[PDB]
Amino acid sequence: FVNQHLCGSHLVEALYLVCGXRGFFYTPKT
Amino acid sequence: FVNQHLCGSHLVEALYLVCGXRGFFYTPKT
Amino acid sequence: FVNQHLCGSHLVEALYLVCGXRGFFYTPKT
Amino acid sequence: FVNQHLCGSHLVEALYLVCGXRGFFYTPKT
Amino acid sequence: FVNQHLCGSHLVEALYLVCGXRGFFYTPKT
Amino acid sequence: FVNQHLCGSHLVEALYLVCGXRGFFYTPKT
Amino acid sequence: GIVEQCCTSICSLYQLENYCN
Amino acid sequence: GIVEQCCTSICSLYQLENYCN
Amino acid sequence: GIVEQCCTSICSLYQLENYCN
Amino acid sequence: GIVEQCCTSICSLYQLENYCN
Amino acid sequence: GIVEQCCTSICSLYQLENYCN
Amino acid sequence: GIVEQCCTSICSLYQLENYCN
Ligand SMILES: [Cl-]
Ligand SMILES: [Zn+2]
Ligand SMILES: [Zn+2]
Numbered sequence: 036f037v038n039q040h041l042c043g044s045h046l047v048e049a050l051y052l053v054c055g056x057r058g059f060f061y062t063p064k065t
Numbered sequence: 066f067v068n069q070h071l072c073g074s075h076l077v078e079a080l081y082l083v084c085g086x087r088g089f090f091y092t093p094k095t
Numbered sequence: 096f097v098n099q100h101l102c103g104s105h106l107v108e109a110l111y112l113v114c115g116x117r118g119f120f121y122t123p124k125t
Numbered sequence: 126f127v128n129q130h131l132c133g134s135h136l137v138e139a140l141y142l143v144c145g146x147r148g149f150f151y152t153p154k155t
Numbered sequence: 156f157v158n159q160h161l162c163g164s165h166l167v168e169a170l171y172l173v174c175g176x177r178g179f180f181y182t183p184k185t
Numbered sequence: 186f187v188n189q190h191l192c193g194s195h196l197v198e199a200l201y202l203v204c205g206x207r208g209f210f211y212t213p214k215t
Numbered sequence: 216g217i218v219e220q221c222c223t224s225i226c227s228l229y230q231l232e233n234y235c236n
Numbered sequence: 237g238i239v240e241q242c243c244t245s246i247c248s249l250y251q252l253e254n255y256c257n
Numbered sequence: 258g259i260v261e262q263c264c265t266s267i268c269s270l271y272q273l274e275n276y277c278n
Numbered sequence: 279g280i281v282e283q284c285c286t287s288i289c290s291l292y293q294l295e296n297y298c299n
Numbered sequence: 300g301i302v303e304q305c306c307t308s309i310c311s312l313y314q315l316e317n318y319c320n
Numbered sequence: 321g322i323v324e325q326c327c328t329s330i331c332s333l334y335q336l337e338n339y340c341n
Contacts (some may be wrong), residue, residue: 036172036173036175036291036311036312036315037171037172037173037174037175037176038175038176038309038311039193039309040305040306040307040308040309041305041306041310041315042302042306043081043099043105043306044078044081044082044105044108045193045194046301046302046305046306047077047078047080047081048074048077048078048168048172048194049172049305049315050077050091050315050318050319051073051074051077051091052169052172052173052291053291053312053315053316053319054316054318054319054320055290055291055319056093056094056095057095057319057320058090058091058092058093058319058320059090059091059318059319059320060088060089060090060091060236060318060320061077061080061081061084061088061089061090061091061301061318062088062089062236062300062301063086063088063300063301063302064086064300064302065086065087065088065236066126066156066157067126067127067128067157067222067223068157068162069218069222070165070288071131071161071162071165072128072131072218072221072222073218073222074165075130075131075134076217076218076221076222078108079112079228079231080231080234080235081097082096082097082108082109082112083096083097083112083228083231083232083235084097084232084234084235084236085096085097085098086097086098087235087236088235088236089234089235089236090236090320091217092216092320093216093218096228096248096249096252098246098248099246100242100243100244100245100246101242101243101247101252102239102243103141103189103195103243104138104141104142104195104198106238106239106242106243107137107138107140107141108134108137108138109242109252110137110151110252110255110256111133111134111137111151112228113228113249113252113253113256114253114255114256114257115227115228115256116153116154116155117155117256117257118150118151118152118153118256118257119150119151119255119256119257120148120149120150120151120255120257120278121137121140121141121144121148121149121150121151121238121255122148122149122237122238122278123146123148123237123238123239124146124237124239125146125147125148125278126156127156127157127158127264127265129260129264130225131161132158132161132260132263132264133260133264135160135161135164136259136260136263136264138198139202139270139273140273140276140277141187142186142187142198142199142202143186143187143202143270143273143274143277144187144274144276144277144278145186145187145188146187146188147277147278148277148278149276149277149278150257150278151259152257152258153258153260157285157286159281159285160267162281162284162285163201163281163285164198164201166280166281166284166285167197167198167200167201167211168194168197168198169291169294170197170211170294170297170298171193171194171197171211172194173291173294173295173298174211174295174297174298174299176213176214176215177215177298177299178210178211178212178213178215178298178299179210179211179212179297179298179299180208180209180210180211180299180341181200181201181208181209181210181211181280182208182279182341183206183208183279183281184206185206185207186270186332186333186336188330188332189330190326190327190328190329190330191326191327191331191336192323192327193327196322196323196326196327199326199336200336200339200340202270203270203333203336203337203340204337204339204340204341205269205270205340207340207341208340208341209339209340209341210299210339210341211322211339212299212321212322213321213322213323214321214323215299
């Protein structure tokens, strides 16, 4: 996998790819 | 015969913009 | 909706999503 | 049975790179 | 009836994250 | 075509679009 | 699910807010 | 322009819609 | 339209310049 | 090819590492 | 949070997975 | 490399094509 700053929509696509079928949660701070 | 995977990618990028600082949870199956 | 700097291809996908079926115009300065 | 919406997303990201500082107008239907 | 072109776009963005500093080669046909 | 800094996944989609059917290679340094 | 309602057919920004946190 | 209002500065959804057809 | 010509089949960078401003 | 194995059906991050440099 | 760990700083795949369901 | 020529500096379409197969 990459080794850099993943930010914005890029951090979410990353989560989308890694997590797969288990889904994920994106909460900047909430 | 459509493709869910590719659609999901689009879906999570859209939720990123739509939800903003509110965030979200992405859940497909189990 | 988000509340941050939308730039480059990211500003265009944003327009794509928001505008919908009415379409839109992207003209940095022109 | 294909999907126009997802294709549009790709189309407008491509026009962003292709057109450059010249810009463009995206118009689907009405 | 699916679409390879749009899938490729997704494929190369995924390889970008997956391969990291290792990089990759993308080859469809000839 | 655009005339700006293409970086990250953005540089790869750019290559994807420009190169077309001949494919391409993404190797940051390797 | 979102995949079922939004991938079978187009969802607007408005129908998408539904799925927000 | 759109770049200065929404990229160089943050701009609301309403402002983003000023660029719809 | 672009959707009709480019989503039914692949358009190159060259066929896309057509739709530029 | 990757297009054949990964566009016909979903490939995981793991099946994708295969195609890395 | 996820923004500070993976965006403001680099974070491994393992760390990225702490945000999976 | 490609990162220094097209990311760290701007690079024309021709230069971008030096990275095609
Ligand atoms: Cl797609
Ligand atoms: Zn897509
Ligand atoms: Zn970006």
